[PDB]
Design an enzyme around this catalytic site. Structure first.
Site, PDB file in Angstrom:
ATOM      1  N   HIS A  12       0.793  -1.269   0.000  1.00 45.44           N
ATOM      2  CA  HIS A  12       0.000   0.000   0.000  1.00 45.44           C
ATOM      3  C   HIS A  12       0.811   1.297   0.000  1.00 45.44           C
ATOM      4  O   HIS A  12       0.157   2.336  -0.181  1.00 45.44           O
ATOM      5  CB  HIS A  12      -1.031  -0.006   1.119  1.00 45.44           C
ATOM      6  CG  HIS A  12      -1.952  -1.168   1.060  1.00 45.44           C
ATOM      7  ND1 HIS A  12      -2.816  -1.378   0.006  1.00 45.44           N
ATOM      8  CD2 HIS A  12      -2.148  -2.179   1.938  1.00 45.44           C
ATOM      9  CE1 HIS A  12      -3.504  -2.472   0.242  1.00 45.44           C
ATOM     10  NE2 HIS A  12      -3.121  -2.973   1.449  1.00 45.44           N
ATOM     11  N   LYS A  41      -3.417 -10.116  -8.364  1.00 41.94           N
ATOM     12  CA  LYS A  41      -4.227  -9.578  -7.235  1.00 41.94           C
ATOM     13  C   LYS A  41      -5.246  -8.625  -7.870  1.00 41.94           C
ATOM     14  O   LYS A  41      -4.876  -7.752  -8.640  1.00 41.94           O
ATOM     15  CB  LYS A  41      -3.383  -8.896  -6.161  1.00 41.94           C
ATOM     16  CG  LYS A  41      -4.197  -8.405  -4.981  1.00 41.94           C
ATOM     17  CD  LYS A  41      -3.378  -7.715  -3.929  1.00 41.94           C
ATOM     18  CE  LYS A  41      -4.113  -7.551  -2.621  1.00 41.94           C
ATOM     19  NZ  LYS A  41      -4.583  -6.165  -2.420  1.00 41.94           N
ATOM     20  N   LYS A  66     -14.333  -2.915   8.751  1.00 41.96           N
ATOM     21  CA  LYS A  66     -15.319  -3.714   7.974  1.00 41.96           C
ATOM     22  C   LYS A  66     -15.611  -5.009   8.739  1.00 41.96           C
ATOM     23  O   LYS A  66     -16.780  -5.427   8.768  1.00 41.96           O
ATOM     24  CB  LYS A  66     -14.810  -3.989   6.558  1.00 41.96           C
ATOM     25  CG  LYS A  66     -15.645  -4.961   5.741  1.00 41.96           C
ATOM     26  CD  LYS A  66     -15.672  -4.646   4.265  1.00 41.96           C
ATOM     27  CE  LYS A  66     -16.292  -5.748   3.436  1.00 41.96           C
ATOM     28  NZ  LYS A  66     -16.095  -5.504   1.988  1.00 41.96           N
ATOM     29  N   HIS A 119      -3.585  -3.001   7.878  1.00 39.63           N
ATOM     30  CA  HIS A 119      -4.586  -3.410   6.859  1.00 39.63           C
ATOM     31  C   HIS A 119      -5.165  -2.142   6.243  1.00 39.63           C
ATOM     32  O   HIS A 119      -5.381  -1.183   7.012  1.00 39.63           O
ATOM     33  CB  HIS A 119      -5.599  -4.340   7.528  1.00 39.63           C
ATOM     34  CG  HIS A 119      -6.833  -4.611   6.730  1.00 39.63           C
ATOM     35  ND1 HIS A 119      -6.917  -5.654   5.855  1.00 39.63           N
ATOM     36  CD2 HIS A 119      -8.039  -3.997   6.714  1.00 39.63           C
ATOM     37  CE1 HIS A 119      -8.118  -5.681   5.303  1.00 39.63           C
ATOM     38  NE2 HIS A 119      -8.817  -4.651   5.794  1.00 39.63           N
ATOM     39  N   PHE A 120      -5.374  -2.137   4.931  1.00 39.70           N
ATOM     40  CA  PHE A 120      -6.097  -1.057   4.223  1.00 39.70           C
ATOM     41  C   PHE A 120      -7.578  -1.454   4.143  1.00 39.70           C
ATOM     42  O   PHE A 120      -7.884  -2.415   3.434  1.00 39.70           O
ATOM     43  CB  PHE A 120      -5.470  -0.830   2.852  1.00 39.70           C
ATOM     44  CG  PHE A 120      -5.958   0.433   2.201  1.00 39.70           C
ATOM     45  CD1 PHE A 120      -7.099   0.434   1.419  1.00 39.70           C
ATOM     46  CD2 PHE A 120      -5.296   1.628   2.415  1.00 39.70           C
ATOM     47  CE1 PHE A 120      -7.547   1.609   0.829  1.00 39.70           C
ATOM     48  CE2 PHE A 120      -5.737   2.791   1.806  1.00 39.70           C
ATOM     49  CZ  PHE A 120      -6.893   2.788   1.068  1.00 39.70           C
ATOM     50  N   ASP A 121      -8.462  -0.726   4.821  1.00 38.59           N
ATOM     51  CA  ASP A 121      -9.893  -1.105   4.975  1.00 38.59           C
ATOM     52  C   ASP A 121     -10.675  -0.528   3.798  1.00 38.59           C
ATOM     53  O   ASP A 121     -11.432  -1.290   3.192  1.00 38.59           O
ATOM     54  CB  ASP A 121     -10.468  -0.680   6.317  1.00 38.59           C
ATOM     55  CG  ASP A 121     -11.506  -1.661   6.856  1.00 38.59           C
ATOM     56  OD1 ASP A 121     -11.285  -2.883   6.735  1.00 38.59           O
ATOM     57  OD2 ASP A 121     -12.489  -1.204   7.417  1.00 38.59           O
TER      58      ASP A 121
END
Ligand SMILES: [Rh+3]
Ligand SMILES: [Rh+3]
Length: 124
Positions: A12, A41, A66, A119-121
């Site tokens: 990211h 991906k 999420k 984590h990228f939500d």
């Protein structure tokens, strides 16, 4: 292994530049980050801010993730991001991506010491 924090930076972070210059950005970067190694991906976001500015999000707006966890944070400011999405006709091993540049808030899950994104939500 790779740490959660390291995997977040690999998938990211792209401080290099202030934005994607060209339509080939996602094809080039998805490959460079090992996200086309065994399969394409399908969806991935790169953030074009400094690591310090993205780690700082862990002290901004606390929000639900999420998944229902409460260790997610929304950036108060918009950030320069690039959304990479695999095309409908993309076929491994010739992984093909549409590049979309945007300024949007990011939402990240934060964990660990130091307390950093893992984590990228979403972007909003
Ligand atoms: Rh994750
Ligand atoms: Rh993960």
């Amino acid at each position: 292994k790779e740490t959660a924090a390291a995997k977040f930076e690999r998938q990211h972070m792209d401080s290099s530049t202030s934005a994607a210059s060209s339509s080939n950005y996602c094809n080039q970067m998805m490959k460079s980050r090992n996200l086309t190694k065994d399969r394409c991906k399908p969806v991935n976001t790169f953030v074009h801010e400094s690591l310090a500015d993205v780690q700082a999000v862990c002290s901004q707006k606390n929000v639900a993730c999420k998944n229902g966890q409460t260790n997610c944070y929304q950036s108060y400011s918009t950030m320069s991001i690039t959304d990479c999405r695999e095309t409908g006709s993309s076929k491994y091993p010739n992984c093909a991506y549409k590049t979309t540049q945007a300024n949007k808030h990011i939402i990240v899950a934060c964990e660990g010491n130091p307390y950093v994104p893992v984590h990228f939500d979403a972007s909003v």
